[PDB]
Amino acid sequence: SLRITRIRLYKTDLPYVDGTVARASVVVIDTDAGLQGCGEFTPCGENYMIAHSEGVDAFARLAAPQLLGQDPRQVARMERLMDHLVQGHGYAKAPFDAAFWDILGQATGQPVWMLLGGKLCDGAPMYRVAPQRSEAETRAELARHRAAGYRQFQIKVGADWQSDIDRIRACLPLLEPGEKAMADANQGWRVDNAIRLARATRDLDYILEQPCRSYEECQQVRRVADQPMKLDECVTGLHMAQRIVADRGAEICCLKISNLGGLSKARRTRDFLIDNRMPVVAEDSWGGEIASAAVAHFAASTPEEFLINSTDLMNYNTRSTGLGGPTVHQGRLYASDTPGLGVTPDFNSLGAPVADWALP
Amino acid sequence: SLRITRIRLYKTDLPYVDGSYGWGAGNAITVARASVVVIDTDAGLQGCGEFTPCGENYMIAHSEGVDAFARLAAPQLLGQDPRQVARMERLMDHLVQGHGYAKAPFDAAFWDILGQATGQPVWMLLGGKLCDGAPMYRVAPQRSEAETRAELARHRAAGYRQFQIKVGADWQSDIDRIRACLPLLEPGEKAMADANQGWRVDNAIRLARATRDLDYILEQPCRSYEECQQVRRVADQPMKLDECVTGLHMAQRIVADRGAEICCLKISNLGGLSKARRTRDFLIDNRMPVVAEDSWGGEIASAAVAHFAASTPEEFLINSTDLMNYNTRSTGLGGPTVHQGRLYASDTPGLGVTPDFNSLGAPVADWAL
Amino acid sequence: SLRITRIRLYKTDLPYVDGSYGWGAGNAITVARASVVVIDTDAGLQGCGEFTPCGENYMIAHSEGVDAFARLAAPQLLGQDPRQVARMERLMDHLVQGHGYAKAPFDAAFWDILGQATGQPVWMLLGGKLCDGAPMYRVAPQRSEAETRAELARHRAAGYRQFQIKVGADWQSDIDRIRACLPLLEPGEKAMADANQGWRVDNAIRLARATRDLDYILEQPCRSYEECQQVRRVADQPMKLDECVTGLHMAQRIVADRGAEICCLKISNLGGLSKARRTRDFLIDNRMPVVAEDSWGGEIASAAVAHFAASTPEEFLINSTDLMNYNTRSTGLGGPTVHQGRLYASDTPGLGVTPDFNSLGAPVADWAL
Amino acid sequence: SLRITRIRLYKTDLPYVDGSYGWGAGNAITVARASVVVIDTDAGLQGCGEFTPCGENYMIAHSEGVDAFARLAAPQLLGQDPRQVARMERLMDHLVQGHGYAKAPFDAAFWDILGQATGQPVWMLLGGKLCDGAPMYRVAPQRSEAETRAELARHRAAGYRQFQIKVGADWQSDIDRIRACLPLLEPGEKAMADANQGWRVDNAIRLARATRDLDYILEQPCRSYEECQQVRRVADQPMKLDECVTGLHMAQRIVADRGAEICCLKISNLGGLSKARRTRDFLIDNRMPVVAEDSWGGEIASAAVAHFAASTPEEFLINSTDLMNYNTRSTGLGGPTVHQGRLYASDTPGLGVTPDFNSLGAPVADWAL
Ligand SMILES: [Mg+2]
Ligand SMILES: [Mg+2]
Ligand SMILES: [Mg+2]
Ligand SMILES: [Mg+2]
């Protein structure tokens, strides 16, 4: 027997470590037994997926009055309640969902990964971005990452196909045979140009990541490209996951929690793709300790054999959303083993809540 | 050159005329929450636009998401040329992906301004008057039984010849009200039974089989397109697809499958007049009959609809509707008129509607300079 | 209110600037035959439009067919309101089926009149200035290595970064043509090998195989779409479809198969500016890169091309072309301009072109109200 | 050895025998405009051909298009060997693309010359007399129960066993026409409801469902093939496809989908007797029932029809028609004959018809070697 007694929405700025600021949305849910749950949505750019930072407010102003008095431990009941209140807008339902999972974990005395089936991966592999500099300086920097445990690297591309060809051709002979490189275009290329790129780099082993915006443009690129393809921002739910599997249309599916509509749907999409023997990346768009805690539990419950990587989202910002969260040890991401999400809100960083709903 | 100098967002309550408007699987609205966007320019031309949902869970659209979008978009829209509608379209689409419902009132205001600057009604800029008076339908909502026999004689004498039976809350009694409404129709008349996504697929099939000997239009029996196609395997009745018609991509699927007999085009579900126009033109070029509509709303939303309907070829326009007449309160001064069961657009420049500032009250948001 | 009071048809020869133009399988044009439609109204607004083929066998189109259509339709078009472009389109499609190239000059005259009536350039009415300056290509060229390098450096200095290789008459020496040209281009430059429907399917495959190590655009290698798809099974090069892109129907199946990397849109091949616009918009919403052009012609044909180009998103517009600059004679006064290898539309009301009555001569036909 | 020495184009009015001829969605033909091509040779062998539309908007074909094609192609055909019909076919298709209706009279004239040079009727050159007297239909009637009975009794006694009901202007009263006509004909007889592209897809489906218990032929209910296939989702009646059957490509699509029970073959819609023969032979090899006919016209068009019918296997030939008997005026001297409700081709060399030069008047165009 449990009831939601208070819902608060927090908003804070998260500046990037190398310079520029993402807008965080934290939801804090209180119960009549005094169990507190938190969840976070933070976009990396407002135009990046069908998701923006102000949409959490909007959803909360409609839903939070209807969520008071309900039992947060029942994550799927809360899921169906939210999906009956508004259709879509999953990015905005996502912080609530995570907070409900946090509460269920506290009530059960278990970490969120245990409620997701167990620890199927002890330390999710991680990647390092870039480097975008001199040849001898990239060589020194990749050696620093390599010594520290990293074997995967993300070439950030997608703003100019022609110089992107140069970036890929320059980076790949600078890494060892045991090492992965994903050229992530972030939906950036036009279909003709992505094909020019793929043809120019056909003699190279790298992962071709979300070359174009839509799934169909990506499949058109795939008609020519032999490189293992990774689909990301277009993986928006189970429907898309079903179509990718039916087409066998990717070698890796990247699973971002808030793009999938929260940890509940993200887990179901993951479970679906694992059962179809599709390798996956477990992450989210952006964020601090609260978003990262959800990510780490999500990765820890993914089979080691099918988990490509995850990411330490909290280490990209100079400011915090939460106290605690996941940790990094030797280039691997580790979930908490303490009950719930293993993260509480950082109220000092968050400020006064922008909105507050409570039971009488 | 023209520049956007000011953007204001207004919110008001639009109560329903009959009291309760029962739709779908147990939903009802007593009051709809309107969102009105008002755009001012440096030549003193003012545009306006409206999104109002009929139910906050009806489509991928809710009233609070308009504010959220405007807080993001409106600062970036200031100083832009509002009469370049497709520049404004792609700018709004560069600022945020999706959320077409929220862009829809801005888009309408832009079309309004363009009409004023050209000295032409919005129907002219949409291709001309291809239908003089869109035929109308009268929706009888979810209520009793012996009282719809007088509702028909009311609307029959009023000029209407098309009627919507609201169903979807219980397939079994729904069979009975389809079966009792149809023999009350006259020869030159039509009836659509709208489930508003309400039936579970097996129950929509039971209904289709129990009413197989009847001539009516089966409208959006289930939530998804795939569910409706599953119903269509068994159902011979002309099918009308509505809330699942989200845009051109779905329109392409429907045409490729030849998967409906009517496609319903709700302006804000399509993401504004710009995208609504393009989806309309696509379906007509593929000889698919259409309904020109929006979700709900007052005079500003109804002005857009009327021009949408007026620029649709009459050979392919099933009906349209007078949304402003469903409410006890207003959003705009002006808008379309009705005469003998047909909806007539304004012939004055722009949308032919100005904001009812007295009804709307103080703006909830105001960006300027 | 506006009424068409006079329809006149003009015919004139436009000789090619460099003697003989070789396209496709050995075909040669030295003089192209222009058809110009001039439309008068009761409020003194005059519109004009043009269709000029490159060759008479180049597409489903020929110069004498405009006369034949005008002889049927021009009596029926008198008294109508030319501002209502979609009404005129529907009316023309009602009088005859197909013959889009013949309806195309009328459609351009109607857009011109609408522009003038609204005080806006045709690009505004097509959505806005979405590309300020369309990229252009050079047609070049056929000589020694040093003379090729010199002429390409002058084009490069003139602002050109796109080059068309005229092929299609002989697959075997076309292979060599391609191999000679590419190493003389710089990184980033586009080369299109336009066979103009010229290769037999097996020979096109041989060419694709012998040039698989090369970065160029393979353009319309065969007549039919199916043939081009059969080449596409082997060819990894970006494929541009042109003369087979005849309308929305074909557009839809190119999209469904993801059948090309570029779709080339010739206004008269699509049946006029109204249909061309709609096919453009469909392809752009499906994120297909496009070329905005026409078959051939003087200033009147070129004015429509430039507005069509200017209202295409810069992101997806591959190139356009300055058709008027290929001829020694004129159909119109005014038209588009060329600046630093880019094609610019006019910003004055309408198409921004008036008929060159002295060059055109006496009308071959005249219908008055 | 033989050479074309002279080509002449004639134009004449063919008034309809019964005043006005109501077809499709609100069309009427009172006078049809014939185009007759006359080809002379150096051995004194003369051939003639004809194209006459049944309404200018009926198919992708109009009367003025023959003139336009001729003006471009006829100077290029002088000196050529007209007996080599495939060489002439391929030359025409090289000179212009499409416009097969305009090529059709030239094609007929070449088959005429070949039959004369070989001393054999055209049916012999198309494979033989595979049907001795093609079965005919009567387009009757359109009136009262007392008057339909007397009219079907005179038609029955005259040998007729197949009846076309002209519908497609009002689906609702077309239901009633079908329902009132079918029980007024005996066991052996047949009836086809030809909507002539006239119904909208939703209305065609309503008609199909209302008459789902009845034995008739659903002919061309909607314009496009895809619209017709959508109707066919619901309609179990034998479907007859007509105007959309434009050539072999569409015949291949139809065969692949098995998308009709009868294919109607109009010579001029297929681009002439040569393409018409190839499309028929392809469909017969795929065991598709066919109708062998043409759009409209006098004795010259009807001569080609009768030879087309006579060389169609009788197991698969549904019917043919006596086109010459629909008009009050002539294009030719001779042509086919009618006996006991069957259409009979001539057995004399060539088409069996000469041009009625007196009815045709002065040549509108004249090309000489
Ligand atoms: Mg990615
Ligand atoms: Mg509906
Ligand atoms: Mg080309
Ligand atoms: Mg027929």
Side-chain angles (χ1 to χ4, degrees):
Chain A
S1 192
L2 205 79
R3 296 180 84 207
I4 293 157
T5 47
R6 203 179 167 187
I7 300 172
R8 286 172 289 179
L9 175 62
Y10 295 87
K11 294 223 94 91
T12 204
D13 283 346
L14 298 178
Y16 184 58
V17 280
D18 280 68
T20 181
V21 166
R23 230 301 195 261
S25 291
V26 170
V27 176
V28 178
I29 288 148
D30 282 291
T31 60
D32 57 355
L35 298 169
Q36 191 186 66
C38 63
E40 187 193 343
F41 168 65
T42 306
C44 186
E46 309 276 350
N47 53 6
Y48 181 74
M49 51 206 17
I50 313 164
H52 61 85
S53 56
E54 290 288 332
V56 181
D57 287 63
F59 175 68
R61 286 193 296 259
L62 208 144
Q66 298 281 121
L67 288 173
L68 298 168
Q70 251 72 225
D71 180 11
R73 282 130 90 238
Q74 303 185 44
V75 303
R77 182 188 265 172
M78 294 307 97
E79 172 178 22
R80 293 193 71 88
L81 186 53
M82 291 190 293
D83 291 353
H84 179 269
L85 296 171
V86 337
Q87 297 192 57
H89 303 77
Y91 65 97
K93 287 164 180 172
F96 287 92
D97 183 51
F100 301 144
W101 277 102
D102 190 18
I103 288 154
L104 171 67
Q106 286 171 63
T108 48
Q110 288 308 308
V112 168
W113 61 257
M114 180 62 88
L115 300 168
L116 261 10
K119 190 168 274 188
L120 269 37
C121 190
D122 209 4
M126 278 166 53
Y127 69 89
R128 273 325 186 217
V129 307
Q132 208 193 132
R133 43 188 69 192
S134 173
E135 201 254 50
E137 287 209 345
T138 45
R139 217 148 204 172
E141 199 185 309
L142 290 179
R144 281 197 296 273
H145 290 318
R146 195 174 288 113
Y150 302 97
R151 301 298 140 96
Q152 312 186 30
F153 307 100
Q154 186 199 47
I155 312 162
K156 226 97 191 265
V157 284
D160 180 37
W161 69 276
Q162 194 199 318
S163 65
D164 293 341
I165 284 164
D166 291 344
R167 279 163 171 87
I168 295 159
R169 279 188 191 164
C171 167
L172 298 177
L174 262 40
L175 43 95
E176 324 275 12
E179 287 179 340
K180 306 283 149 218
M182 38 242 78
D184 192 341
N186 286 125
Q187 307 158 101
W189 302 311
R190 204 175 52 196
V191 77
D192 52 328
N193 291 331
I195 277 153
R196 293 185 86 175
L197 181 129
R199 285 187 79 216
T201 63
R202 66 153 66 109
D203 50 293
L204 296 173
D205 176 39
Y206 68 101
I207 296 154
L208 180 57
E209 184 171 355
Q210 193 77 43
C212 294
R213 200 199 215 87
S214 65
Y215 177 65
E216 289 95 340
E217 280 166 291
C218 290
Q219 294 304 289
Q220 188 182 349
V221 173
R222 186 162 177 88
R223 188 195 74 79
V224 163
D226 274 9
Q227 288 92 357
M229 200 185 54
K230 178 172 163 199
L231 291 176
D232 191 340
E233 292 93 330
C234 80
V235 191
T236 56
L238 188 69
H239 194 273
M240 186 62 257
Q242 285 168 214
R243 199 169 152 208
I244 290 158
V245 166
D247 293 338
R248 297 308 300 189
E251 277 65 53
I252 306 151
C253 286
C254 188
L255 303 177
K256 293 197 212 294
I257 289 177
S258 69
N259 193 22
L260 294 162
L263 190 54
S264 287
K265 287 175 172 62
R267 173 257 206 120
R268 292 200 306 270
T269 301
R270 181 207 48 203
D271 284 347
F272 173 76
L273 297 158
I274 292 316
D275 288 334
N276 282 290
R277 303 182 61 89
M278 174 73 69
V280 298
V281 169
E283 50 183 34
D284 200 6
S285 50
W286 207 244
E289 293 82 358
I290 305 172
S292 305
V295 166
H297 280 102
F298 188 45
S301 51
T302 313
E304 168 187 300
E305 56 262 48
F306 285 111
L307 185 63
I308 302 292
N309 60 69
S310 187
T311 185
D312 58 338
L313 293 164
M314 72 295 174
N315 287 334
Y316 289 103
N317 325 300
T318 55
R319 293 192 75 254
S320 299
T321 50
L323 270 4
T327 55
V328 178
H329 166 86
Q330 283 161 23
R332 284 176 178 270
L333 212 221
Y334 294 86
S336 307
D337 303 317
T338 56
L341 274 175
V343 74
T344 75
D346 185 359
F347 297 110
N348 279 186
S349 299
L350 286 169
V354 298
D356 193 352
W357 302 264
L359 271 175
Chain B
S1 188
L2 194 69
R3 296 182 80 185
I4 290 169
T5 56
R6 198 179 183 178
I7 304 161
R8 287 174 288 200
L9 173 64
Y10 295 82
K11 305 210 89 77
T12 205
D13 276 328
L14 303 173
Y16 176 57
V17 283
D18 299 308
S20 187
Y21 190 78
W23 65 269
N27 291 310
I29 48 131
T30 49
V31 62
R33 235 280 191 266
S35 306
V36 171
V37 176
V38 171
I39 312 281
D40 289 286
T41 67
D42 55 4
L45 295 180
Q46 182 188 94
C48 64
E50 189 190 338
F51 168 67
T52 308
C54 184
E56 303 278 358
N57 56 352
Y58 182 59
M59 51 196 35
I60 308 166
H62 65 111
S63 62
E64 290 283 356
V66 177
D67 307 46
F69 173 72
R71 284 196 298 270
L72 253 142
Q76 307 283 136
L77 289 174
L78 297 159
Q80 292 287 308
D81 187 349
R83 65 227 217 280
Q84 311 196 27
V85 296
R87 194 198 260 170
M88 298 299 98
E89 178 181 6
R90 99 121 137 49
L91 179 57
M92 282 188 307
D93 285 357
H94 169 259
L95 291 173
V96 356
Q97 293 189 48
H99 305 82
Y101 67 95
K103 305 173 165 156
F106 287 87
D107 183 47
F110 298 148
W111 276 100
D112 192 10
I113 284 157
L114 171 65
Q116 289 174 58
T118 51
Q120 287 297 324
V122 167
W123 59 257
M124 184 65 81
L125 312 162
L126 256 20
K129 195 171 275 183
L130 272 50
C131 184
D132 201 8
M136 290 172 48
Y137 77 96
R138 272 302 170 197
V139 50
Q142 290 188 240
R143 43 198 68 183
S144 198
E145 274 276 351
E147 46 92 49
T148 45
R149 211 175 210 273
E151 260 197 305
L152 259 66
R154 171 158 68 100
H155 299 313
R156 204 192 324 276
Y160 304 97
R161 293 295 179 273
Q162 297 185 44
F163 315 107
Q164 195 172 77
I165 314 154
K166 285 234 161 299
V167 282
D170 168 34
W171 69 276
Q172 193 187 314
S173 77
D174 289 349
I175 283 165
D176 286 344
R177 48 151 73 76
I178 286 166
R179 278 194 198 154
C181 172
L182 300 201
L184 276 36
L185 263 68
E186 282 198 337
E189 275 160 21
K190 255 133 217 69
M192 48 229 77
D194 195 350
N196 291 114
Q197 312 161 87
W199 297 316
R200 200 180 51 204
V201 77
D202 58 320
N203 292 329
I205 279 150
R206 290 199 212 265
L207 182 131
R209 296 186 73 220
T211 63
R212 62 158 59 107
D213 67 320
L214 302 170
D215 177 32
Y216 68 95
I217 298 154
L218 189 45
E219 183 173 356
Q220 192 74 25
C222 306
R223 208 214 278 287
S224 62
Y225 179 65
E226 288 94 354
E227 268 172 303
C228 295
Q229 288 309 289
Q230 186 173 352
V231 172
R232 183 170 172 90
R233 196 194 74 86
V234 176
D236 272 11
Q237 287 97 357
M239 194 168 82
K240 177 174 171 213
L241 289 171
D242 185 356
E243 301 93 296
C244 69
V245 188
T246 45
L248 194 59
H249 196 265
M250 178 59 55
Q252 284 157 214
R253 283 183 78 189
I254 297 169
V255 163
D257 298 343
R258 293 306 297 194
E261 274 70 62
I262 309 169
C263 275
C264 196
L265 306 175
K266 292 204 203 308
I267 287 158
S268 59
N269 202 18
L270 292 163
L273 202 53
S274 291
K275 291 204 213 322
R277 180 224 200 141
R278 289 199 310 263
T279 290
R280 187 251 277 127
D281 283 2
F282 174 78
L283 288 167
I284 269 129
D285 280 350
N286 284 288
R287 302 178 63 80
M288 176 70 63
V290 302
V291 167
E293 230 177 28
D294 207 359
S295 43
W296 210 246
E299 296 91 358
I300 301 170
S302 299
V305 167
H307 288 103
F308 190 40
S311 54
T312 305
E314 67 168 11
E315 202 212 321
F316 287 106
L317 183 65
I318 299 309
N319 54 54
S320 187
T321 193
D322 59 340
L323 296 167
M324 74 288 188
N325 281 333
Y326 288 83
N327 315 298
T328 71
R329 290 184 81 259
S330 285
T331 53
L333 287 342
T337 57
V338 328
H339 172 92
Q340 288 168 6
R342 316 181 81 90
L343 182 77
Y344 295 86
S346 302
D347 296 321
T348 44
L351 286 174
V353 68
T354 67
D356 190 356
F357 288 115
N358 185 76
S359 289
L360 304 162
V364 298
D366 196 343
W367 305 261
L369 186 131
Chain C
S1 179
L2 198 65
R3 291 152 208 78
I4 290 173
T5 51
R6 196 170 180 188
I7 291 154
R8 280 175 299 187
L9 180 68
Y10 292 86
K11 286 190 91 55
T12 204
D13 288 347
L14 300 170
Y16 176 60
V17 79
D18 303 304
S20 184
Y21 183 81
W23 63 266
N27 298 290
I29 159 259
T30 180
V31 158
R33 232 286 148 87
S35 303
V36 169
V37 170
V38 172
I39 309 221
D40 291 301
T41 62
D42 56 0
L45 301 182
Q46 188 190 90
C48 69
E50 178 193 339
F51 164 64
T52 306
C54 195
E56 308 275 9
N57 59 353
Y58 180 61
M59 43 200 34
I60 305 158
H62 68 105
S63 53
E64 284 301 318
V66 183
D67 307 43
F69 171 73
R71 282 195 303 267
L72 221 186
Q76 304 286 129
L77 293 178
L78 293 168
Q80 294 291 312
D81 182 355
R83 298 171 308 171
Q84 305 193 37
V85 299
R87 182 189 271 182
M88 296 298 96
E89 174 182 11
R90 184 149 143 91
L91 175 60
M92 291 191 299
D93 293 0
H94 181 257
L95 299 161
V96 359
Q97 305 192 36
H99 305 85
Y101 64 97
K103 301 173 174 156
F106 287 82
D107 180 54
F110 300 149
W111 277 98
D112 185 16
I113 284 156
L114 179 57
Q116 288 178 54
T118 50
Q120 290 306 317
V122 171
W123 61 256
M124 182 63 83
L125 304 165
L126 294 176
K129 190 163 276 174
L130 266 54
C131 183
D132 203 9
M136 272 165 50
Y137 65 92
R138 275 294 153 255
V139 238
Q142 253 230 305
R143 36 207 35 139
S144 146
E145 187 208 54
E147 285 166 46
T148 299
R149 278 193 206 272
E151 204 183 325
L152 291 179
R154 293 171 205 153
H155 288 325
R156 213 169 277 119
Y160 301 99
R161 233 135 296 271
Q162 293 181 48
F163 306 104
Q164 196 195 43
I165 309 157
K166 257 37 253 290
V167 287
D170 173 32
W171 69 276
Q172 190 182 321
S173 73
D174 289 339
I175 283 165
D176 292 346
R177 260 196 195 88
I178 295 160
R179 289 209 160 266
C181 187
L182 301 192
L184 276 32
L185 265 60
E186 286 189 351
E189 285 171 358
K190 279 162 176 276
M192 25 257 111
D194 194 348
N196 280 131
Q197 308 164 268
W199 303 313
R200 198 178 61 201
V201 71
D202 58 319
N203 289 331
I205 282 150
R206 289 193 179 95
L207 174 133
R209 288 190 82 224
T211 62
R212 65 152 56 98
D213 50 302
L214 300 180
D215 175 30
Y216 65 97
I217 296 159
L218 186 52
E219 182 173 353
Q220 193 68 52
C222 303
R223 195 182 219 81
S224 64
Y225 178 69
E226 286 85 358
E227 275 170 297
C228 297
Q229 293 306 292
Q230 188 174 341
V231 178
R232 182 165 180 81
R233 191 196 71 82
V234 178
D236 280 341
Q237 281 92 3
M239 178 166 292
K240 178 160 166 212
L241 290 169
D242 185 343
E243 294 102 290
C244 71
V245 197
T246 59
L248 197 72
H249 201 257
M250 182 59 68
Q252 284 168 216
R253 82 182 290 204
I254 292 166
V255 167
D257 305 339
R258 287 305 165 326
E261 273 65 62
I262 304 165
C263 292
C264 189
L265 310 168
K266 294 204 207 299
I267 288 174
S268 64
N269 201 22
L270 290 160
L273 191 46
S274 292
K275 281 173 179 71
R277 173 222 211 167
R278 291 204 305 270
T279 292
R280 201 258 293 285
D281 277 2
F282 171 82
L283 285 163
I284 301 270
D285 286 355
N286 283 285
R287 304 180 61 89
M288 176 70 76
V290 301
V291 173
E293 56 178 37
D294 210 357
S295 46
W296 208 247
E299 290 82 0
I300 305 172
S302 302
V305 165
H307 286 107
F308 187 45
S311 52
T312 311
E314 186 163 47
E315 312 93 81
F316 298 105
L317 181 57
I318 300 290
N319 62 74
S320 201
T321 180
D322 58 338
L323 299 169
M324 72 285 181
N325 283 338
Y326 288 102
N327 310 307
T328 48
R329 293 185 78 257
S330 306
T331 51
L333 267 15
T337 51
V338 177
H339 167 73
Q340 266 154 26
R342 307 185 86 91
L343 181 74
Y344 289 90
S346 294
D347 298 323
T348 52
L351 285 181
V353 70
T354 64
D356 191 348
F357 289 110
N358 292 153
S359 298
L360 284 172
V364 303
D366 197 333
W367 300 266
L369 181 57
Chain D
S1 186
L2 193 68
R3 294 185 92 206
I4 290 173
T5 49
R6 198 189 189 175
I7 294 157
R8 282 172 291 176
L9 178 63
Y10 298 84
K11 295 194 87 57
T12 205
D13 281 352
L14 300 180
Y16 183 56
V17 73
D18 292 325
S20 182
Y21 189 55
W23 67 267
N27 301 307
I29 159 257
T30 306
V31 165
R33 231 283 202 269
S35 296
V36 173
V37 175
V38 173
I39 284 140
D40 282 292
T41 65
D42 52 2
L45 304 174
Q46 195 191 65
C48 56
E50 187 194 334
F51 166 65
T52 314
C54 41
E56 305 289 355
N57 64 330
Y58 185 76
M59 45 194 34
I60 308 169
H62 63 112
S63 48
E64 298 292 337
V66 185
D67 303 46
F69 172 79
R71 283 195 301 265
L72 220 145
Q76 303 288 114
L77 299 160
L78 304 168
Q80 292 294 315
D81 186 350
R83 292 125 89 232
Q84 311 199 26
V85 297
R87 185 195 263 169
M88 295 302 97
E89 180 187 355
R90 296 196 74 90
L91 178 57
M92 304 213 261
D93 292 354
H94 177 253
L95 297 166
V96 346
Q97 291 194 59
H99 300 78
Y101 67 96
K103 302 172 171 158
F106 287 91
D107 190 42
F110 301 152
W111 278 100
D112 196 5
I113 287 161
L114 174 65
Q116 291 173 59
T118 58
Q120 287 302 327
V122 174
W123 59 255
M124 177 63 86
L125 300 170
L126 303 163
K129 189 167 283 166
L130 274 47
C131 182
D132 190 45
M136 280 161 58
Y137 66 94
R138 282 320 193 207
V139 325
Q142 269 193 17
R143 49 213 59 157
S144 171
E145 193 194 4
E147 285 180 2
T148 47
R149 282 200 178 104
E151 281 154 7
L152 287 175
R154 70 86 143 73
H155 274 328
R156 187 174 285 111
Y160 303 95
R161 230 59 63 168
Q162 295 175 49
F163 307 109
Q164 202 177 64
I165 323 163
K166 230 90 211 288
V167 286
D170 182 18
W171 68 275
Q172 207 144 32
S173 73
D174 289 348
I175 287 168
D176 291 356
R177 271 184 195 86
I178 293 160
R179 278 175 174 168
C181 166
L182 291 184
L184 274 48
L185 39 87
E186 63 193 56
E189 286 153 333
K190 233 78 118 228
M192 51 232 82
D194 190 0
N196 278 122
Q197 297 166 297
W199 296 317
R200 202 179 58 205
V201 73
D202 57 326
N203 290 330
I205 273 147
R206 296 195 185 90
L207 184 131
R209 292 185 77 214
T211 66
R212 71 159 66 171
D213 53 294
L214 303 179
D215 185 28
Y216 68 98
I217 300 162
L218 192 43
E219 182 174 348
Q220 196 64 45
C222 300
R223 198 191 235 169
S224 63
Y225 177 61
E226 288 87 2
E227 266 177 305
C228 289
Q229 290 307 289
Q230 188 171 345
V231 178
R232 188 174 173 78
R233 193 190 72 82
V234 173
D236 280 6
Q237 282 85 19
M239 184 164 279
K240 191 177 161 200
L241 295 185
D242 191 343
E243 291 103 296
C244 69
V245 191
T246 50
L248 194 78
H249 184 265
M250 174 55 61
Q252 286 163 212
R253 175 122 167 79
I254 292 164
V255 166
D257 301 342
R258 289 308 262 180
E261 277 68 55
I262 303 162
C263 281
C264 195
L265 305 178
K266 288 191 200 309
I267 291 173
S268 56
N269 200 17
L270 294 167
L273 194 56
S274 302
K275 297 187 161 56
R277 178 252 264 273
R278 289 199 311 270
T279 299
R280 150 195 94 206
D281 284 355
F282 165 87
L283 291 161
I284 292 263
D285 283 330
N286 279 279
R287 299 177 66 85
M288 178 68 75
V290 295
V291 175
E293 53 178 37
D294 201 6
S295 46
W296 203 249
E299 297 86 350
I300 305 179
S302 303
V305 168
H307 285 106
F308 188 39
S311 54
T312 304
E314 70 173 1
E315 314 93 76
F316 289 96
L317 180 59
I318 295 301
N319 61 58
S320 189
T321 186
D322 55 331
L323 291 174
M324 70 291 175
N325 288 331
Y326 285 109
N327 325 293
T328 61
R329 291 185 80 258
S330 303
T331 59
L333 269 9
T337 56
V338 170
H339 185 57
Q340 298 182 353
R342 312 182 80 91
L343 215 221
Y344 292 91
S346 320
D347 292 340
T348 57
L351 278 179
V353 67
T354 67
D356 186 353
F357 289 113
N358 183 81
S359 287
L360 289 176
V364 303
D366 191 335
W367 303 267
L369 196 41

